[PDB]
Amino acid sequence: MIRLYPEQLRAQLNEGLRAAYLLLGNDPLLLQESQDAVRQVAAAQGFEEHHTFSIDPNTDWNAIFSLCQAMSLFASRQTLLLLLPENGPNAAINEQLLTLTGLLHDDLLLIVRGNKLSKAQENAAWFTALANRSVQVTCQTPEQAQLPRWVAARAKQLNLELDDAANQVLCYCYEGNLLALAQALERLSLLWPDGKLTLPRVEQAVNDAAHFTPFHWVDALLMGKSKRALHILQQLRLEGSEPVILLRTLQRELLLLVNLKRQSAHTPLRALFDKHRVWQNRRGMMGEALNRLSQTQLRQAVQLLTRTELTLKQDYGQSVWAELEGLSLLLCHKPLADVFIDG
Amino acid sequence: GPHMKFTVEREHLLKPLQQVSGPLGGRPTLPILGNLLLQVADGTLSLTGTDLEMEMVARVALVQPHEPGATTVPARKFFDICRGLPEGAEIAVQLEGERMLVRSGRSRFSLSTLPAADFPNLDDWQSEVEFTLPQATMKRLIEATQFSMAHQDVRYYLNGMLFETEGEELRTVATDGHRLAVCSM
Amino acid sequence: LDDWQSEVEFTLPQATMKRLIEATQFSMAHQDVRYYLNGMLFETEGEELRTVATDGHRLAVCSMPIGQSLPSHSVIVPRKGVIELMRMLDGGDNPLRVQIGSNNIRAHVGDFIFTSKLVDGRFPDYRRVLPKNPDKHLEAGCDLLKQAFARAAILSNEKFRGVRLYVSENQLKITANNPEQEEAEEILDVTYSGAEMEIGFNVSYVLDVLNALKCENVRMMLTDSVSSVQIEDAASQSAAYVVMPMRL
Amino acid sequence: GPHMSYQVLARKWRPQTFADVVGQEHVLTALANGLSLGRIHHAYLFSGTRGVGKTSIARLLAKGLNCETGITATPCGVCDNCREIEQGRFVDLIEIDAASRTKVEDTRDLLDNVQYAPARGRFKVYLIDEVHMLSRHSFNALLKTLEEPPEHVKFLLATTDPQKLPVTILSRCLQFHLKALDVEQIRHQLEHILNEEHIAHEPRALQLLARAAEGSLRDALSLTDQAIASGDGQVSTQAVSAMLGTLDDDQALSLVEAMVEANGERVMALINEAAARGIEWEALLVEMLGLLHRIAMVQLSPAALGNDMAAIELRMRELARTIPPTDIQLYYQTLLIGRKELPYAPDRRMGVEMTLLRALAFHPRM
Amino acid sequence: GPHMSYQVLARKWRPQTFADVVGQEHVLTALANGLSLGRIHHAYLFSGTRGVGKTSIARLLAKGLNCETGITATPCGVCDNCREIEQGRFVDLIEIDAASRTKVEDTRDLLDNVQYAPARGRFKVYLIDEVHMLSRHSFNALLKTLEEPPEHVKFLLATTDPQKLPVTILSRCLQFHLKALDVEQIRHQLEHILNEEHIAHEPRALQLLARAAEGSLRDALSLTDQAIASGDGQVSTQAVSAMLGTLDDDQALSLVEAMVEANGERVMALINEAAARGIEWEALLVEMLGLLHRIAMVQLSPAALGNDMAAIELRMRELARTIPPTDIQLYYQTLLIGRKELPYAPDRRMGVEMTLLRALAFHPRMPLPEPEV
Amino acid sequence: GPHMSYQVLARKWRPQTFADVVGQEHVLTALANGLSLGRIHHAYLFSGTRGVGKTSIARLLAKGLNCETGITATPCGVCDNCREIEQGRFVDLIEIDAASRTKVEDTRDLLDNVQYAPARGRFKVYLIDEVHMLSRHSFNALLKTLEEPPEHVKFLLATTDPQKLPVTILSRCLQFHLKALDVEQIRHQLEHILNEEHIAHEPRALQLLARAAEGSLRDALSLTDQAIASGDGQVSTQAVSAMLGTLDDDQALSLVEAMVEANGERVMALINEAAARGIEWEALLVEMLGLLHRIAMVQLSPAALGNDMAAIELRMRELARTIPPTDIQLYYQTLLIGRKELPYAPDRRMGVEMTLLRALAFH
DNA sequence: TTTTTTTATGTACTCGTAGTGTCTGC
DNA sequence: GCAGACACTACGAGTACATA
Numbered sequence A: 001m002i003r004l005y006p007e008q009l010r011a012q013l014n015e016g017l018r019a020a021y022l023l024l025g026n027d028p029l030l031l032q033e034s035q036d037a038v039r040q041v042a043a044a045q046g047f048e049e050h051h052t053f054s055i056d057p058n059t060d061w062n063a064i065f066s067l068c069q070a071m072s073l074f075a076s077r078q079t080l081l082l083l084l085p086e087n088g089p090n091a092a093i094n095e096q097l098l099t100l101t102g103l104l105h106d107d108l109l110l111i112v113r114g115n116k117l118s119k120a121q122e123n124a125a126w127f128t129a130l131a132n133r134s135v136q137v138t139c140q141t142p143e144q145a146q147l148p149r150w151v152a153a154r155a156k157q158l159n160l161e162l163d164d165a166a167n168q169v170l171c172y173c174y175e176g177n178l179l180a181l182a183q184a185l186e187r188l189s190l191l192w193p194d195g196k197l198t199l200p201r202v203e204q205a206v207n208d209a210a211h212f213t214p215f216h217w218v219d220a221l222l223m224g225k226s227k228r229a230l231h232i233l234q235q236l237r238l239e240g241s242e243p244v245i246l247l248r249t250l251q252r253e254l255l256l257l258v259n260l261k262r263q264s265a266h267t268p269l270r271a272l273f274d275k276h277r278v279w280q281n282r283r284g285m286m287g288e289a290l291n292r293l294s295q296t297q298l299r300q301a302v303q304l305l306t307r308t309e310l311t312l313k314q315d316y317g318q319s320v321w322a323e324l325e326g327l328s329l330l331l332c333h334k335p336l337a338d339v340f341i342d343g
Numbered sequence B: 001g002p003h004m005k006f007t008v009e010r011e012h013l014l015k016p017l018q019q020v021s022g023p024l025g026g027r028p029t030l031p032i033l034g035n036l037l038l039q040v041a042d043g044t045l046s047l048t049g050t051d052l053e054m055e056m057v058a059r060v061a062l063v064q065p066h067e068p069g070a071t072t073v074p075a076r077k078f079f080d081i082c083r084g085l086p087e088g089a090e091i092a093v094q095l096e097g098e099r100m101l102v103r104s105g106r107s108r109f110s111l112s113t114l115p116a117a118d119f120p121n122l123d124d125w126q127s128e129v130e131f132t133l134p135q136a137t138m139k140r141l142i143e144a145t146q147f148s149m150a151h152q153d154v155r156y157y158l159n160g161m162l163f164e165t166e167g168e169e170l171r172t173v174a175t176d177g178h179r180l181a182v183c184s185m
Numbered sequence C: 001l002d003d004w005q006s007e008v009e010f011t012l013p014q015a016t017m018k019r020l021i022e023a024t025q026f027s028m029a030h031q032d033v034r035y036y037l038n039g040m041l042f043e044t045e046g047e048e049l050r051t052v053a054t055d056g057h058r059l060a061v062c063s064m065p066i067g068q069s070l071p072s073h074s075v076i077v078p079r080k081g082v083i084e085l086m087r088m089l090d091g092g093d094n095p096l097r098v099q100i101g102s103n104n105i106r107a108h109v110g111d112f113i114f115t116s117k118l119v120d121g122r123f124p125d126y127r128r129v130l131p132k133n134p135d136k137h138l139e140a141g142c143d144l145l146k147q148a149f150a151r152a153a154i155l156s157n158e159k160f161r162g163v164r165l166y167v168s169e170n171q172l173k174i175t176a177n178n179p180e181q182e183e184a185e186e187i188l189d190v191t192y193s194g195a196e197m198e199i200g201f202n203v204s205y206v207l208d209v210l211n212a213l214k215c216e217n218v219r220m221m222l223t224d225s226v227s228s229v230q231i232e233d234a235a236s237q238s239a240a241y242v243v244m245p246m247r248l
Numbered sequence D: 001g002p003h004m005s006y007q008v009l010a011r012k013w014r015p016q017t018f019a020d021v022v023g024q025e026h027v028l029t030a031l032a033n034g035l036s037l038g039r040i041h042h043a044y045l046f047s048g049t050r051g052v053g054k055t056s057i058a059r060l061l062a063k064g065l066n067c068e069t070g071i072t073a074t075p076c077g078v079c080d081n082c083r084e085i086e087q088g089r090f091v092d093l094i095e096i097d098a099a100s101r102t103k104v105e106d107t108r109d110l111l112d113n114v115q116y117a118p119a120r121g122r123f124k125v126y127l128i129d130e131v132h133m134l135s136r137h138s139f140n141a142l143l144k145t146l147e148e149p150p151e152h153v154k155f156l157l158a159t160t161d162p163q164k165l166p167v168t169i170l171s172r173c174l175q176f177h178l179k180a181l182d183v184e185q186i187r188h189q190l191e192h193i194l195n196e197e198h199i200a201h202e203p204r205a206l207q208l209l210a211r212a213a214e215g216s217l218r219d220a221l222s223l224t225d226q227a228i229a230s231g232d233g234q235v236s237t238q239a240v241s242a243m244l245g246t247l248d249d250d251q252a253l254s255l256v257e258a259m260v261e262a263n264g265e266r267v268m269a270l271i272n273e274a275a276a277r278g279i280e281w282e283a284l285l286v287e288m289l290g291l292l293h294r295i296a297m298v299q300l301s302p303a304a305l306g307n308d309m310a311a312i313e314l315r316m317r318e319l320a321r322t323i324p325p326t327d328i329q330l331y332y333q334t335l336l337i338g339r340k341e342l343p344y345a346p347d348r349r350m351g352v353e354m355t356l357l358r359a360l361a362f363h364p365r366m
Numbered sequence E: 001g002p003h004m005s006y007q008v009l010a011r012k013w014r015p016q017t018f019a020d021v022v023g024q025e026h027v028l029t030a031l032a033n034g035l036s037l038g039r040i041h042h043a044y045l046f047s048g049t050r051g052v053g054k055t056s057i058a059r060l061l062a063k064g065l066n067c068e069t070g071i072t073a074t075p076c077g078v079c080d081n082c083r084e085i086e087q088g089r090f091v092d093l094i095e096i097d098a099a100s101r102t103k104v105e106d107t108r109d110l111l112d113n114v115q116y117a118p119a120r121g122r123f124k125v126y127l128i129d130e131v132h133m134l135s136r137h138s139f140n141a142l143l144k145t146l147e148e149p150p151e152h153v154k155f156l157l158a159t160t161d162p163q164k165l166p167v168t169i170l171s172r173c174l175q176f177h178l179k180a181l182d183v184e185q186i187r188h189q190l191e192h193i194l195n196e197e198h199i200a201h202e203p204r205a206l207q208l209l210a211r212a213a214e215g216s217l218r219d220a221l222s223l224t225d226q227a228i229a230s231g232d233g234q235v236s237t238q239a240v241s242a243m244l245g246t247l248d249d250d251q252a253l254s255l256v257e258a259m260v261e262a263n264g265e266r267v268m269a270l271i272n273e274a275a276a277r278g279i280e281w282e283a284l285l286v287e288m289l290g291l292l293h294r295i296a297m298v299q300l301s302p303a304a305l306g307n308d309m310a311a312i313e314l315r316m317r318e319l320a321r322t323i324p325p326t327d328i329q330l331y332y333q334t335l336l337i338g339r340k341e342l343p344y345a346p347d348r349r350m351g352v353e354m355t356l357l358r359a360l361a362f363h364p365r366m367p368l369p370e371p372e373v
Numbered sequence F: 001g002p003h004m005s006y007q008v009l010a011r012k013w014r015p016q017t018f019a020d021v022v023g024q025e026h027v028l029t030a031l032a033n034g035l036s037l038g039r040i041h042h043a044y045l046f047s048g049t050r051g052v053g054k055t056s057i058a059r060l061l062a063k064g065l066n067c068e069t070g071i072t073a074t075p076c077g078v079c080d081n082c083r084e085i086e087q088g089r090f091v092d093l094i095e096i097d098a099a100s101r102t103k104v105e106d107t108r109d110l111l112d113n114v115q116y117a118p119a120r121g122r123f124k125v126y127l128i129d130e131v132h133m134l135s136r137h138s139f140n141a142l143l144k145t146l147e148e149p150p151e152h153v154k155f156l157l158a159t160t161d162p163q164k165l166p167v168t169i170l171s172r173c174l175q176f177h178l179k180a181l182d183v184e185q186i187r188h189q190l191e192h193i194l195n196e197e198h199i200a201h202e203p204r205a206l207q208l209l210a211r212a213a214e215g216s217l218r219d220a221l222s223l224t225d226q227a228i229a230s231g232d233g234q235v236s237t238q239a240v241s242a243m244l245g246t247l248d249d250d251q252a253l254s255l256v257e258a259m260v261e262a263n264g265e266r267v268m269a270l271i272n273e274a275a276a277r278g279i280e281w282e283a284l285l286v287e288m289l290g291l292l293h294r295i296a297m298v299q300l301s302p303a304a305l306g307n308d309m310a311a312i313e314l315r316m317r318e319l320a321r322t323i324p325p326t327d328i329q330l331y332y333q334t335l336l337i338g339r340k341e342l343p344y345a346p347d348r349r350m351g352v353e354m355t356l357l358r359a360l361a362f363h
Numbered sequence G: 001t002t003t004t005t006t007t008a009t010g011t012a013c014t015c016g017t018a019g020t021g022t023c024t025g026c
Numbered sequence H: 001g002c003a004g005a006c007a008c009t010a011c012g013a014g015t016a017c018a019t020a
């Protein structure tokens, strides 16, 4: 219930165990390595038998068998590692968890692992009853701007030297995909145990395998950088989200931006953003975005976008995903189109 | 090349086929593992069936004339051929070229085989503890402590019996977890 | 649900209906484009309650005399109703009261009356389907033929369980092939005399027919390779079956 | 409970003999030549617009293939096999509601039992109707059976359009394109049917029903059955004219001349009057296009008007004299585009108003 | 003898020797050279449009491989194995109608049975037809076997759209593309078929059939059978022309020349003649568009005319020389708009009449005169 | 006749040692450095594209982890276990074709052999090729085996589409990513292969084969088999010229370059190529329109895209700036009108011909 | 820090479950 | 006998994918 960060969960792990542990937060790899650290700490301590249970609706609780009966040949305590569903559990499972805690033995440990829960799921009967002694901890992957420091810190922990150019190429190639980042770090360490990597082969042992959620796409398109936007779209290949999500995203911000430009003659852009708290990390990134445009520019953007909107859904076009390449690139160096398209 | 000659009866062939082809159900990784190895050596038939884990070998006396050789036959098809034939009928077998022909007087079948060289065998080893236990005693040992096994357990060794020996006595440990069992015969 | 007219009453042990359905159930259509082909045809005659089932390529007709005057009436009952009716048969001592209507079939068993909806169609004329000339006729032991056909079929083609009869003077030769070529040959001594002939046909169907009737000595009738085979028991003529050949 | 249920003309008068079929001379001649000469084929697909007779031709061919007389060009009609096919009981004619039975599962099921000999007939005809709604897997499943079927099985395909089929199947059957039936054939067939059915009819009413069906026996015959409900027992000219919404009056050319002279008020008044009277709008624009065509044709070559055109020549030739040749084609294109967009308009009257305003926008000076 | 059985031209005339093929060079030569040099690759996919020979070429190659004598590029038609594959249902050729075998539950069984040795001949030939219909799991299952099959197994994969296959399957096996045939080859094949059939034929009808076959031989053979049925057992230009709906009647060049010469009366006369002939109007418009297109192509380069169109070549050249390109484009656009508006015309004859009239009156060098003012 | 069965070059020239692997310096060096020392993760996931070496490299790890000498980055040459793995048969390596084994009723049994003793040689090691086809429950069984793997065993793993695996197993496995071969790598390897047996070769054929291989080495070997077949035991420029009808790609830019003038036979040759190739005419004209639109974009911006056609950044730019923008707009109008009316032409080839003729009619 | 928002229809595959044939030392 | 094994086969659901 404490709702702390794993940098402190390590501290509570070093001290006396605070009964059941619940580590949450959507994690690429940090959840698994935190689980591994918990496993090794427990193995050093009493609890050694890690029984893996997948918490899911429509799946009966075989954990009661461990809960009601104690181990007989090697007790050695034991730990129940629970895997939560990606949407959270239901009331039946939440109350059966409380029943299990009622069946808890002194050598039993409860570990609940999952993603962020809903408020009712968070404040269920089991969590409420365990709020007296259990702990809660959450973590999330670093952002784009927070990546270089994290990568450098991990490199310094692993006793391998990095460089600014190497960090740049890593944060470009592996942006938010820490599993790939960790594998690349291990590969660069094992390839050359010299301990000096500046830019000799870091690209040779690093591919383009990273996640890219749509919110950053306009962040490039608002500068109108042709090569950068084209490279971002090429990076989006092989993890290709269906076009509808990207289309919804850019229609959202373009409707917001056209409303902003309509109201620009009225109350200034900052106090207008006061209504448009879309948390674009300052609401000022949109402020520098709106600096480079024109009303005719917005017309040329919206015509192509709305033509695509019927180009993929009215007749089910197959090039429409590649059309996202077409629409984003043409806006980069189009101050205003002299009609000739006006879709 | 090889050409073996079977001359056998159903009653002395049904049970060995059952004992050698019982565990051979399902689809195995090598297709030869789904096959049953027939060997005709001296006046002896050796029927071999494997699952990469256990081998059943049945020996059948060949009182009637025979020819030595080695081949492999689809176990289910051969068993269903031997089964259902009239009681007391004689099965004769000749493996010609590629196919093996079975005959019961008024019936003839031609089954496809696989070369005997492809069939895997378990290498010889040294048997440390060799004994001739009474069959009933071993049956008691198994049954009195087999109800507790803990099949499908994470330990990946709790799933099997343990056998311990000392002097003229032995025990069978039923590694189960919350259950233990032992038997001293 | 209300009562119906054109309602003839039956009085028969459950064993009679069980024998009838078990005689003509394995050859009833299952999810076929011919919608009338599903279910069984129950036809009333002054002699028996004849029943007809067909897939278009297995025509099984059973005729158990009932001992009552029956106005001529032809009915088709769907697969579901037939299965349920067969499930409700047991005991063999209670008299089953079968009540036919224009659009429904009811039946009183013991103390309960159950009903089933009735397929709307015009079933084919089975008598024309039955061959018009039994010029080539043979008789053979039922269990011997059944055992021989099982032996041959164990190497038959999986998807198309197809064997071939070769009928010569007092001899039946069963030949079966399959992908991953395997040949099964079996010779039976039969009571046949006539023209030499070969005919390919499904073996699952014939094994099913022999399983259904299971008499002492069967006899089949047939003319030419394309001609369908009409199999019945040599003791009586109450049950007849028609199997359509493979190849052509 | 009438005779079965086909008290409707659409089912009662489907032909039972190649002699009884109307039109389709080329395909009937081809099928008769193939049947009699001995050149037979295992897969015919009949492609043509709706209500032309591809299903009927297919069933009649199925009759002709399995008549006890032999492989006869003209089916017996009285022999037992023809009677059974008429009843639908015939266990070798396997009709398929391919629009309903689309799953590849059922196609595979019906292909597994192709090797069986026919129960009673010579040929096991697989009549498939509405083939174009087979799932792509079903189309490709039919391939190796369509190409080389056994000696005894013959396929019949009856599709509304041929181009939706994969080019593989389209290249393994005889494509018989059923030519759409012209007005005279429809009129003669309808008159013969009505004389057989003993209900009085007027020739011009039959002409209307023929010209409104756009070449379809089923469509025209359904329209006649609709008129019989309206016109009590008789297909009378007045009743069918009111039902079909024909432009009996001369307001068509009146609003034509109002539109070409940019008289917006007059055009709107005529439209309001027509809507009040209860006009039909698609026929209005069809008449517009016809009148414009006649005006243009006599603008090029005089003395081209006929009957009613030759009577209203006093106005038509004046219009051809005053309207330049270039603007006539533009008016015609605008009117036909409006007719194209009539379905894509929430109100038909509003769609016609839109079309007329688009036309008047060519010269919107006043 | 002539063997009067009248059983489908397509099936009767499937190639049986290596030379009866219609004239695919780049694949027949490669296959023959591979079989001669001993390089018998274990898996290869034939692609190409419908009815070119890929399913036939596969059967010929299986015939060649499993011949009784040594591997010969040209199979014999006398040995037991060649006769058996000739008659179908051959012992060692497993022809798998993959469109009926798409479930992985059957491809797994196939790969289970692949190990057992064949009984006759040298190889067992898995002719998997319509490969592109296999379900994804079946393809992945086939992958490892295709990479390293046993010594005695060859996979004959044939399909129509190889791009549907997973790219790894394309990598595992060779790729032979069968080009759609030329008009000369297909016409020669039709001549051979009709001459051996002892059926009289006319050259114009054969040229029509070749043109309408769209470069796929089975289309031409089916059309030839349909024309044989259409006529009284003879192939005639009249029967083929009336059955195809082509406008060889009164050509179409008269109509286009009346267009460019702006004679409305000539256009009306030709339209009335066609209407009495009962021709379909959209085909007439398509013919006019094609004529305009060929005129433009010849105006760019005189060698654009086809040899099948060598009947009216002088007037074609003259019209190419006279009419400026812009007028040709204007005619093409007007007639194309007319064809687009045909379904929405009040009548097809009337719509085509007005399309002709519009393309006439807008002719710049000779427009329809304004009536009075 | 029935003699001299030259089996595929894909199978004959399959690498035997790490020195015979073309390209992929990173994977080779990483595993070489990892094999000398004992830090071996219990599961090695290999991923790449079609026909590169994932399976070959996995065979090499089975070669290395199991030898009489021991865990060696250097090859073994000949020693029983690794000798046995040159051919199919081998006792302590079992190659589960995961495509044929997807259900748990099979993969649970196969993984259940992990707790048996290893065969001759240490490191019971199995290669589950194409892992992306395992069922969800199969992946759960694999995860339960990976979380507590027996120390005496390891097992490799391969795939082609790594995105289908669960994140748990991907995070657990020490994934190596295998890169697509570059053109030079494939060209030199094919040169070596051809020189090895007996076949003469000219260089241009080999560049063409490498370009058409699209990067997969197995693809290059299949195409060299076809080239040898067509060329009658000699891969000369003519057989690969017959292949050139398939590998000829650059066609949409040349027609755009030839539209702005009357080049004579260029337009006829290009339309002949398009007709004999039969690519989508609608897509062809859409590519035309896109090229023309980016050209108009460059007219109003001297470097509007820059990354467009880097190989044609010395010819496309001339028509990107020299041609007046009015002519570009007129050409765009012509091509748009052609596309709008294309399906209604008698044939789409005729339609694209007419679009080209209209474009050439004006300027 | 919680934030918008495409379908119908079809085809496979794999995992439970459920129902049923068949038959084995019990 | 025979019920329980034991197999085997069919059906629904959940999921992944395709194509119009």
Ligand SMILES: Nc1ncnc2c1ncn2[C@@H]1O[C@H](COP(=O)(O)OP(=O)(O)O)[C@@H](O)[C@H]1O
Pocket: D009, D010, D011, D012, D013, D014, D015, D020, D021, D022, D023, D024, D049, D050, D051, D052, D053, D054, D055, D056, D057, D217, D218, D221
């Ligand atoms: N060629 C024809 N001859 C006679 N009647 C016809 C013809 N075509 C259509 N009909 C009439 O149309 C009705 C439906 O015909 P049908 O053959 O089902 O057309 P479709 O091709 O659209 O299925 C028939 O019942 C018949 O009255």
Ligand SMILES: Nc1ncnc2c1ncn2[C@@H]1O[C@H](COP(=O)(O)OP(=O)(O)O)[C@@H](O)[C@H]1O
Pocket: D147, E009, E010, E011, E012, E013, E014, E015, E020, E021, E022, E023, E024, E049, E050, E051, E052, E053, E054, E055, E056, E057, E217, E218, E221
């Ligand atoms: N190359 C060819 N030579 C001769 N006939 C051919 C050829 N290609 C196709 N055909 C004709 O087409 C019929 C079917 O050809 P088929 O080989 O099935 O084409 P597909 O490649 O589409 O399966 C053959 O019976 C033959 O008459």
Ligand SMILES: Nc1ncnc2c1ncn2[C@@H]1O[C@H](COP(=O)(O)OP(=O)(O)O)[C@@H](O)[C@H]1O
Pocket: E147, F009, F010, F011, F013, F014, F015, F020, F021, F022, F023, F024, F048, F049, F050, F051, F052, F053, F054, F055, F056, F057, F217, F218, F219, F221
């Ligand atoms: N690194 C390599 N060295 C040598 N041959 C290779 C290499 N990569 C691929 N190949 C060739 O491609 C064929 C198939 O290779 P494979 O390793 O199965 O590719 P995949 O990664 O797609 O499973 C091999 O037989 C070999 O000829």
Ligand code: BEF
Pocket: D048, D049, D050, D051, D052, D053, D054, D055, D160, D218
């Ligand atoms: F086109 Be029809 F109405 F079948």
Ligand code: BEF
Pocket: D168, E049, E050, E051, E052, E055, E160
């Ligand atoms: F008719 Be082919 F096989 F496309």
Ligand code: BEF
Pocket: E168, E171, F049, F050, F051, F052, F054, F055, F159, F160
């Ligand atoms: F075998 Be590879 F993944 F193409």
Ligand SMILES: [Mg+2]
Pocket: D055, D129
């Ligand atoms: Mg119909």
Ligand SMILES: [Mg+2]
Pocket: D147, E055, E129
């Ligand atoms: Mg084919």
Ligand SMILES: [Mg+2]
Pocket: F054, F055, F129, F158
């Ligand atoms: Mg691979």
Ligand SMILES: [Zn+2]
Pocket: E066, E067, E068, E069, E075, E076, E077, E078, E079, E080, E081, E082
């Ligand atoms: Zn031969």
Ligand SMILES: [Zn+2]
Pocket: F063, F066, F067, F068, F069, F075, F076, F077, F078, F079, F081, F082, F083
């Ligand atoms: Zn070694």
